Amino acid sequence: ENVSGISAYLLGLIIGDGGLYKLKYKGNRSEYRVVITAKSENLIKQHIAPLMQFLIDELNVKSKIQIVKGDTRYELRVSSKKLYYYFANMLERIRLFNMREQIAFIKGLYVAEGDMTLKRLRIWNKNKALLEIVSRWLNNLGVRNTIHLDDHRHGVYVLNISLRDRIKFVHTILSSHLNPLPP
DNA sequence: GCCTTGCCGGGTAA
DNA sequence: GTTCCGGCGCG
DNA sequence: CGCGCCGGAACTTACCCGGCAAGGC
Ligand SMILES: [Mn+2]
Ligand SMILES: [Mn+2]
């Protein structure tokens, strides 16, 4: 499914570079936000927004894509209870992703939290449990890898992909024509 | 000698 | 990345 | 009166980048 592939790719960006927020305001007001942040205004308008719009359209979600200018980065934001629970639930059953979803989700996550030079192959995150899930998926794909505590200051773990499988990983996960192609 | 990777600090893009 | 602010609509 | 969609933007750090050097072959 095109929809499931795209969803999974977005979830990787969201988990990596944004978030899912259930906000409570005065007085009894609420808001449900789906967010991806990024330094480049173009990357958001030209690569991400179209992907999100499409999804919003397939799900018949009524909200709009807001792009907000912040002091340090741009924010792509969708305010929508439906979309919020769409992704929140998708995340809960992450261990049940098929292979299309695993591949897409890793692509998005790498685009968000990865070594973009590609000189090394690395994914940082404080959530070890999440990295271990990606570790198992990668192993099943024949991409060897390890997980260590990289940043002792803040508790950040890195998942190191072995250069031995550089080609396997790059051609298989990053350059996959089956899902949204990375930047 | 050349690569791979564990560990690290800088500071900004989250 | 996360969570405040002050708006608005709608049953 | 109770909630959920817009539009901003202040407020801290968790990411990414790139060096070093120990260890493998
Ligand atoms: Mn992150
Ligand atoms: Mn990023």
Query: How many folded domains does chain A comprise?
Result: 2
**Looking at the structure, do residues A58 and A125 belong to the same domain, yes or no?**
no
Please name the nucleotide lying closest to A22, CA to C1': C3
Alpha-carbon torsion, ordered A100, A104, A105, A110, to 10 deg: 150
Regarding whether A29 and A107 lie in a shared domain, the answer is no
DSSP SS3 for A116: coil
Same domain, A11 and A71: yes
Interacting residues of A39 by C-beta distance below 8 A, sequence separation 6+: A72, A73, A74
Q: Is the CB of A21 under 7 A from strand C?
A: yes
What is the stated resolution of the deposited model, in angstroms? 2.6
Farthest CA pair distance, chain A: 57
CATH classification of the domain holding A152: 3.10.28.10
The catalytic site residues of A sit at: 17, 113
Q: How far is the CA of A91 from the C1' of C10 (A)?
A: 31
The CA distance from A167 to A37, in Å, is 29
Closest-CA residue to A69 (of A41, A49, A91, A92)? A41
- Calculate ∠ Cα A72-A78-A84, nearest 5°: 115
Q: Can you give the distance from the CA of residue A169 to the C1' of nucleotide D9 in angstroms?
A: 39
The whole domain housing A5 covers 1-97
* A85, A120: one domain: no
How is residue A99 written in tokens? 């292979």
Q: At what angle do helices A99-113 and A128-140 cross, to 10 degrees?
A: 130
Q: Which of residues A59, A80, A97 is at a domain's end?
A: A97
Per DSSP, the residues of A143-174 read --EEEEEEETTTTEEEEEEPGGGHHHHIIIII
Q: How many CB atoms lie within 10 A of CB A32?
A: 18
CA separation, residue A58 to residues A52, A65, A83 (Å): 10, 14, 11
User: Which stretches within chain A are classed as H helix?
Assistant: 2-17, 41-43, 49-58, 81-92, 99-113, 128-140, 166-169
Q: Which of the ligands is closest to the CA of residue A114?
A: 2
Residue A93: both structure tokens together: 């059953």
CA A111 → CA A27, A54, A107, A148, A169, distances in Å?
Answer: 39, 20, 6, 20, 13
- Nucleotide C3 C1' to residue A32 CA (A): 12
- Cα–Cα nearest to A78, from A52, A51, A58, A57: A52
Residues A86 and A6 in one domain: yes
Strand C and A17 CB separated by under 7 Å: yes
Q: Which nucleotides of C are covered by protein (CB under 7 A)?
A: 1-9
> Cis omega (within 30 of 0) on the bond before A19?
no
